[PDB]
Design a protein around this nucleic acid. Structure first.
Ligand code: DTP
Ligand code: MG
Length: 417
DNA sequence: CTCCAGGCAAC
RNA sequence: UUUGUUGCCUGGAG
């Protein structure tokens, strides 16, 4: 049956190679992915037997506080490499049981689906005429998952008692706080490979309810939003759907994040929309802000890196960044921040030549005319002031940065379309 | 298409 | 320090 199919050699090797590919930091017992094979070779006889019997209670997860993009802190729960290995093996077999029967409009944590699919569908509704969003998000979503309501929804498709106990064991598994196991009454650990699937299994009913009501929506994990014809209809469905998941499913809603605003006045998966009669996809203000922040630190202040290395490091971020944000239909802002990147990249180039003699040497070598060299080389104007002067645009223009290895943001934006 | 390494995004 | 799912981007071996 199922737990036999989970523990098949072929399934465990694919689960092994995943854990090893991730190179995650060790769980509570300090064994890294680098010695996962040698661990299982030594202890599989004990592990294999113990878990199929129903007795195996897994190792408690490790608590790690990390920052979230919103502002606050996220409590991680890192299982042991073997518990990551086992959870992966469960996930690999449970996926084809549940995933085909998940909603058409569910895009989070699923294979062959991404954030772009969720945004394009969301755009489709506002483009047709449903020009008001019912934005929503849940408070501490993974932490506030009730074990009984989860396992009930798991029990619908998987009838095997051995795996239901195994999944519950991982839910039950505690946290090790300075050498004591603290029991977990509610919540799946953020860090267990099986946790995202379990999250979708619970919210599967939310999709079916919204599908039953005949509502247009796009879900990506807890970030769910429903699109409507007017604000009255949007306000109506907001508190109605709020009470559904709060009583039937028992999950709290984040009222700070949840709102019934216009779609172009809110952010959905790092994107927003435009006021236009056909609503174009644009960058969210935070998406621009985070790019700026990352470019500001990559360009060297008290940091100290080689110049061509920084061009490679900026390329490596920006080319990766535009890989995701290519979905936007506004090259104007992309042209602006590309120019801004160059102005930031001139700040380092300018500060590299501190003395005027080196400035005169480098500008003359670059091909700038002798009148322009002397006019700017010995200026009282600040570094950020001199970066936007006619002289430094000429000497260190887009032509220079392209010829010295810098990848054009807007070029690759077009080349990815 | 599967596999390897480096990265970027969403949650 | 930093786990996880999922998707893509760049290079390499089949
Ligand atoms: N880096 C991550 N590692 C592991 N799980 C994550 C990570 N980021 C997000 N998740 C998971 C766990 C979260 O409960 C779930 C929904 O994300 P998110 O809404 O950002 O956090 P949250 O729902 O726990 O808190 P919040 O109250 O701030 O919305 O996605
Ligand atoms: Mg949330």
């Amino acid at each position: 049956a199922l737990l036999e199919r989970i523990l098949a050699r072929d399934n465990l090797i694919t689960a092994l190679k995943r854990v090893e590919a991730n190179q995650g930091a060790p769980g509570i017992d300090g064994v890294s992915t680098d010695q996962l094979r040698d661990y299982i070779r030594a202890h599989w006889s004990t592990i294999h037997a113990q878990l199929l019997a129903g007795t195996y209670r897994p190792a408690p997860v490790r608590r790690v506080e990390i920052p979230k993009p919103g502002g606050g802190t996220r409590q991680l729960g890192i299982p042991t490499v073997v518990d990551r290995l086992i959870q992966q093996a469960i996930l690999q077999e449970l996926t084809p049981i549940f995933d085909p029967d998940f909603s058409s409009s569910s895009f989070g944590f699923r294979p062959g689906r991404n954030a772009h699919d969720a945004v394009r569908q969301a755009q489709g509704y506002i483009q047709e005429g449903y020009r008001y969003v019912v934005d929503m998000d849940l408070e501490k979503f993974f932490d506030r998952v009730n074990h009984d309501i989860l396992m009930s929804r798991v029990a619908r498709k998987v009838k095997d008692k051995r795996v239901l106990k195994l999944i519950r064991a991982y839910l039950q598994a505690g946290v090790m706080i300075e050498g004591v196991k603290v029991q977990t009454e509610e919540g799946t650990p953020q860090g267990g490979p099986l946790s995202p699937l379990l999250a979708n299994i619970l919210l599967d009913d939310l999709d079916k309810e919204l599908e039953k009501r005949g509502l247009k929506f796009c879900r990506y994990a807890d970030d769910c939003n429903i699109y409507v014809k007017s604000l009255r209809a949007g306000q109506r469905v907001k508190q109605s759907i709020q009470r559904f998941l709060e009583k039937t499913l028992k999950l709290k809603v984040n009222e700070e994040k949840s709102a019934v605003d216009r779609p172009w006045k809110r952010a959905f998966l790092g994107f927003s929309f435009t006021p236009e009669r056909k609503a174009r996809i644009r960058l969210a203000p935070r998406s621009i802000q985070r790019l700026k922040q990352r470019i500001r630190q990559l360009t060297n202040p008290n940091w100290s890196i080689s110049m061509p290395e920084r061009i490679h490091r900026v390329n490596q971020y920006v080319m990766g960044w535009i890989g995701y944000f290519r979905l936007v239909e506004t090259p104007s802002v992309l042209q602006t921040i590309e120019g801004w990147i160059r102005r930031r990249l001139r700040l380092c180039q300018w500060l590299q030549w501190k003395r005027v003699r080196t400035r005169i040497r480098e500008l003359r070598a670059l091909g700038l005319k002798e009148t322009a060299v002397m006019e700017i080389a010995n200026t009282r104007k600040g570094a950020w002031r001199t970066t936007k002067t006619p002289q430094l645009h000429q000497a260190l223009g887009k032509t220079y940065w392209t010829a010295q290895g810098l990848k054009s943001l807007t070029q690759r934006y077009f080349e990815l379309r």
